Amino acid sequence: MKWFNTLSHNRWLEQETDRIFDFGKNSVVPTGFGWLGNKGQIKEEMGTHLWITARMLHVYSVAAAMGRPGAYSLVDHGIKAMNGALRDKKYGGWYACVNDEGVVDASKQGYQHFFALLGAASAVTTGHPEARKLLDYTIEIIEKYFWSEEEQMCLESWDEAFSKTEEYRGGNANMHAVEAFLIVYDVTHDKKWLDRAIRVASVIIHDVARNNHYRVNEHFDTQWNPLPDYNKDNPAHRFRAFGGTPGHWIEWGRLMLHIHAALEARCEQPPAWLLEDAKGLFNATVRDAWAPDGADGIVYTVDWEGKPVVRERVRWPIVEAMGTAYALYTVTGDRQYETWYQTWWEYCIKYLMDYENGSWWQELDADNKVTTGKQDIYHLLHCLVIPRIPLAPGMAPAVAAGLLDINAK
Amino acid sequence: MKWFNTLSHNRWLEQETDRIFDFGKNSVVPTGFGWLGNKGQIKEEMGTHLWITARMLHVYSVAAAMGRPGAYSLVDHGIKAMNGALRDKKYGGWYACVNDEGVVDASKQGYQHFFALLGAASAVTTGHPEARKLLDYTIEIIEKYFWSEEEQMCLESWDEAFSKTEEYRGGNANMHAVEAFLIVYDVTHDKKWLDRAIRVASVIIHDVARNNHYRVNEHFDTQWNPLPDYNKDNPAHRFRAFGGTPGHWIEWGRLMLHIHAALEARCEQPPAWLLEDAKGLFNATVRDAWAPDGADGIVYTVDWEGKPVVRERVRWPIVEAMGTAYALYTVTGDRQYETWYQTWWEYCIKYLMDYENGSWWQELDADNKVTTGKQDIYHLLHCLVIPRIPLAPGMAPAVAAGLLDINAK
């Protein structure tokens, strides 16, 4: 079967993309974007998280570019939210969480700020009068507290008043910085942002993952020395879980291809290691996490031997795997990648998609049974929109440039 | 943010267009098309109006051209209805309104007869075997009692037996004559109809509106002298309301652009005043009618000072403003026209579109809150289909010639 670049498949994707945009509409709250439950209803107690608000701003910037009435207004709501109670106008940056009664979590977290940077860069492709203003501010905050000058890497987090940064370095914060850097690069054509992106990846993927059977090490100390046994005493705990999470490996793979595509787009040969490492990460993910325990699906975490630790099938990992499959196919033409893409779509519609209550299920059993909400729709664009556009420039910029389906027939 | 000429946006417009065709299918009644309420149910006390019946015939001629099974049948039903109880087999033309018991209103109104002309001209593009026959007849009636020889303008109304014509001349009847003449021109290529169209436009818009800050004067006496104070002592009355109706100003602009496009299509440099006046009318509309009273939306009427009189936001004015925004953009390429188009679509999906009960709401108060049917869908094609085809030839002809999305990517 041939799906990639076929107008028939892409139309199915767009139709699913609309069902997804619709689901996100209800997250709208005075202070930003709320946390949606299993039936698309707001879960008041969760409040307004910075990362969710940043992601929604990003998601609706893409919907606005696709010509959907109402999306721009959500982009506008997101920009107002990023200029409201979420912003710490005394110390700078944004609180991790707030609600209609005040600040819930005042910490300043890197990954959530890089998501703010992404939302800002994507919002800019809509042409919204305040977008460029939000991005400029975000860049200042990022270059002041999250992009280490001496380390040339991303910091993890700080206390509310930016008095002390956490003595830890993580891969997820750096990966999403890579992600946001790509779009910032697209809306400024200032190579500094792409340089940082490749720098971060060379350190975490090219120097460490590559020497670890492509199993990405997530935890590091202040000197950026790996801490492989981090949380080994409690491997089941999900926060900064022990070992590697295949979901991130495969994400890192697509992002490097985006970097790969950007260099070529400006007639600059990409270092061969971008594609080599993307291939290895995809391979590592399939090797250790795909249907390794007697059932299909991608497990959540694996140890340093490649053996599954957290066997739950969280939604985003397989969603990202499809995005990467598409990315590798686009670069290599190797049809094996499309086979995986399709194999995973089969899985997704059979166990994840929820037409009854809306959107997709968030987490499943090791037997793929729904487990005892659905606060994200951001990852879904990576398997719904990404396979419809080129790897360069980034998604929002690509859809805004009108590159949707340009390679399909 | 680009929407115009993008297949992604146009796919959205078509999906909305189908939801609209669906909504109107219930209007079907023995004698023609009924009056649909807020839930899409027929309000039988309203009976069968000539204007509504004529409009539906027009709408479904476009639906048939778009390849929707069933549309042709409604077209067939319309043609037969225009040949039945609605037609005055004794004096000629059509009764303004009828029902099962008989004639509800026997007056012969110009604007409604011109819609009859539009409906017939649009039916002709479906190829229906009785369409040409219906057009020829409508033309006889029009050239006999509604297009004045000595005036070279259109009459307003006559009593049932055509013994006495009303001693009044209105812009609305003449505006729809222009609208109708354009399509008649497209299906006969007899310049006479385009000559008449530009003629009434030079009189009502180029000569009077143009020197009245582009605020169109609607009421005139038998000598075509404007009656600016018509209904001044009752500014609120809807029928022949005092002052100007921005919704009509904006309509006249698009129609004049259709004329402009018609002249270019046949290698004839269009008189520059067509574009100039279209710009002025559009500008006058945003100037006085858009968000003038502390809230968004296009007010209904304004005085000769540009001050709002009737502040309710009726659905069709902003709908037409969008069609015109498309027309001006298409001719001038000025992106500002697109921004207005988007501003208005954002407003429409937020306060006008009714996904719950169907179609769009009909009227909102000055605060954009619904007030209390939905008897029309004809205006909606001007913001759903028009943005997908060139300005020449007319809508039905263009869709029938297969020009849908001809310029999109």
Add this chain to the structure above:
Amino acid sequence: MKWFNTLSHNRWLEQETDRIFDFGKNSVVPTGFGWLGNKGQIKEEMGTHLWITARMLHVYSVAAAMGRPGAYSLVDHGIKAMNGALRDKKYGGWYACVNDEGVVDASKQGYQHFFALLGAASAVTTGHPEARKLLDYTIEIIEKYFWSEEEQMCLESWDEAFSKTEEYRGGNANMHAVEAFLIVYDVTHDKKWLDRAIRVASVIIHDVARNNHYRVNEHFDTQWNPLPDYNKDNPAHRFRAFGGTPGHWIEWGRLMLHIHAALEARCEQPPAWLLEDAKGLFNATVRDAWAPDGADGIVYTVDWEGKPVVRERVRWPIVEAMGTAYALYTVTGDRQYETWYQTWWEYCIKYLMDYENGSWWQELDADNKVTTGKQDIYHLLHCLVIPRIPLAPGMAPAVAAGLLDINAK
């Protein structure tokens, strides 16, 4: 074997079209366009014919629309000539022939005035600021001296002062009137021009030719009674040759299809006889004129039993046949017409095309051997340009409309 609607074949045609445009550029003389000899050199002795000048005006309006620089400058030269020496400043119309000295032939030829009409209408598609004026002026004298209001047919010729019209009616003058009318109709949309075309064809073809085995009777008396034995005394004499000339039969066919397309372009069902008779004329042409004397080629004239009279293979007859073959194919879809088109192209490049001295040969003996200049290129566009555009609107209008290769893949 497929050629029609194939980009590859069409590219070949365009490339040959350019070779043809080039050749004609050398005919430029102060008073208009000269008579090119067998090597593209001007034959001063021939002077400046009205028909040659008007044809070139038409030819370069097409080249101009094709984006070839210099073409518009020739169009300009043509409009100045039509306003200079060739134009009778005392009686109106144009002298049949002139030169740097004075008027060589002062008679007012009907067919040359219709070529004047065609030339002006084609010039109008270029947008030249003086073309619309020349057309308007040409229409006046045409409706004044060549389009008989009482006959509803075209006259043959007048003396210089327009005091006496010839007591003769010919098919050639009327056919070119139809050719010119189509285009005039395309740039004005005055129904009458098409009605007139329809009327002329219905008399000369549907009434006479049809009842004459589809062999067109060329000569008539003032009351349109056919003179079948006109010049029977000198069958060889070419000026108003005896019998019928297949070349004209096939042209008529294509012109009726252009009328056919015109009618459908405005959503009108064309009377059946147009296609019927087109097919009849094409069948007769191949039946009596193709390879009827031991060698390939289309003979010049035939007697009323279909037997060849003047056997020389002149250039324009087979050129036209190819054009009509395309027209019939476009309407019927019958692949046999394409086989003929291909059969005739092979004959042409083998016997008519002259890459050596330029352009195409003008005439060959019954053995297809060259004999004795090359004063025309107008006909060549009917096998070179026509096959790349739809039948409606006319050639010049259709190319200026951007329809070149619209149906080719």
Add this chain to the structure above:
Amino acid sequence: MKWFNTLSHNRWLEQETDRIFDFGKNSVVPTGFGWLGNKGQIKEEMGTHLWITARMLHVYSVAAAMGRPGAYSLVDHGIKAMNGALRDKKYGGWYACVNDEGVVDASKQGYQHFFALLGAASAVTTGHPEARKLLDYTIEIIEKYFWSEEEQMCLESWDEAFSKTEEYRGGNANMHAVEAFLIVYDVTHDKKWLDRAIRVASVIIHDVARNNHYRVNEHFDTQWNPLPDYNKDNPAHRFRAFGGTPGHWIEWGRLMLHIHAALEARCEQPPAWLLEDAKGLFNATVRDAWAPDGADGIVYTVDWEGKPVVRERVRWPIVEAMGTAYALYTVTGDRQYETWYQTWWEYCIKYLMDYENGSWWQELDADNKVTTGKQDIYHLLHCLVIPRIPLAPGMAPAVAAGLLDINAK
């Protein structure tokens, strides 16, 4: 640098193709196609060769499908030639060579009969009424004398009377049989022709060449035992030269991909070795024959250690190399193949193309200097037309199915 699938490069190719089609038009003689010299003149002493006549039949079948007037005529001339003098009315098959005086060479050569098969199969795509007949007749002769049912391979040659077949087997005869089998299969869909191509390829390439460092072994004995030292005492002594000729290795590669594409075209996964070996043959060609003696170019002959024997640069070897580079690129997506294609195109216009005297030079010395006709143009289509069409169906079938430039933008 991107060339493949770009309309700009393909336009250059077509324009160069036409120059080649033109050069070959002069080879026409009463008995078929003659031998053209360094200036496109016929070298009558060479007579009418079977292989030359068949190739031209094949070539102009492609030109005819490309819409070039005159091509079909040559195709017709070719078919009549295959039914004329060249055909042995007594014993069947075709003489190796004839001229106006009689049979110059009455031997029945295999490779020449396979070119006959090819020429007929390509002719079939033009739809010439006599083409199918010639193909069936050619098939009978092939299955009766050249396709060994017991050997499941192709014979080399027979005496005029088909009494004794040469006790020798060669790679070239079998390669061209594979070439012709591809097209015969495309116009018959008789599975056996493709099964035979695969069979032949699996022996000569997968069984032999593969175990010989991918250097094709050309000479075999009656039982197919390789004769590596065949004519080793007669090195440069042309006609069955000693060692391997890279040009052929590279042709085998392309033909195997054609087989590969054919299998996929009917939803059948092709044997892995087809592609693997094609890559192997390409590698060996560049490894041994490309720029191996101090200058650029592909040497004609090499020994079993990869050392150049005959160092002259013949034209076709590098031309085929370009065709295979494209083939390998279309299948693998590896840009390295396009780079080679480009470096070879650079070599060609610099040393082989002869715009001065026409077409391309035939052979150059080891310093790339012209030596001393131009009897062929058939090979050229492999670097001029092949890069514009997919690998399946074959060339002629593909151009006739209208696939020219289908994958280019």
Add this chain to the structure above:
Amino acid sequence: MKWFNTLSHNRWLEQETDRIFDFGKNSVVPTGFGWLGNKGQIKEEMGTHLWITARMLHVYSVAAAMGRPGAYSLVDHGIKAMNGALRDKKYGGWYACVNDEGVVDASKQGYQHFFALLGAASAVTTGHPEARKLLDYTIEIIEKYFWSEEEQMCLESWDEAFSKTEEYRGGNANMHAVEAFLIVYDVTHDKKWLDRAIRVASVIIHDVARNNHYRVNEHFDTQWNPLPDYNKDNPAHRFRAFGGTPGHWIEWGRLMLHIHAALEARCEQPPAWLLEDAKGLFNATVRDAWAPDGADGIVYTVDWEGKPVVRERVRWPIVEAMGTAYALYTVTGDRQYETWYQTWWEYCIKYLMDYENGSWWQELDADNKVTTGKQDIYHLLHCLVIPRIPLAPGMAPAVAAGLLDINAK
């Protein structure tokens, strides 16, 4: 009459482009590219100029991206030249002129070094392995001797040893710097190059020309004080001619739009003055230099009152006018820019194109008659290639990105 974005017109441009590419192929010499004469022969006495070699390297990078074999070989020759004789191995940079015996002119001219930067940057789009190397090296020399860090403008020239810069500042050097910066920026995305372009243009155009009736002031002293009376004593002297040079005015306009396009390509709204000033420079060009002395054409120099000084008609000024006309049309949509483009194309084919001896004439007298070689083809790509691609990225980059005819139908 429309030509812009029509495949037919663009095919005519490409075909003429090839004629120009061919003419320059003979300028090849050992040390680079030579001076071509009125017959395309090398004027060996002129030697090998840096600017010429730099331009050619740039021109063939474009031809190479267009799929023309041979082009890449010239790009390679160009790069080896920039690394050979022309390069001053002792002091760095490149001599203004050399020949096979040695250095003819050891001076280091600014505008020529900026052409070096251009050629190098365009060379990078081919992917030539040594192109990036050349660009980097060129950037070093530019940032060290020609881009004043202190002035934020470009220097004019230095002595062979880079020990003293000329106490003069000029517009031409800084303009070609802007031209080169656009492309360097396209193949690096180092914001500074576009910022420098903006900077340079804001000084020379927005501050000076804008306040000088949009007449560009060429000459400045060391502190950038305008020297409007420079060479006023000998107005006819060609070197640093007195007054303004319209040709340059119009080039500046186009370059500013390339900047406009770049800014938008990265979702950034460009300063309004870029387009405002482009319109201004274009208007002034037409106002003062087009047909101001009794004959059509663009004069070479004009004084501070707009009166013509040097009336000779040089080739490049009008060539750039056509290029800018296209640019303004692409951004404004104003059809009047297309009329000028067409008006200028008619002039060109009539008086400048030389089909007889090749390429175009270099200069004409005030009556448009040829005077007295043809050492350039670089300017011609601006009226032949530019109108076939968007304004961003630059020409070499855009063609290599495969955007040729992207907007044409």
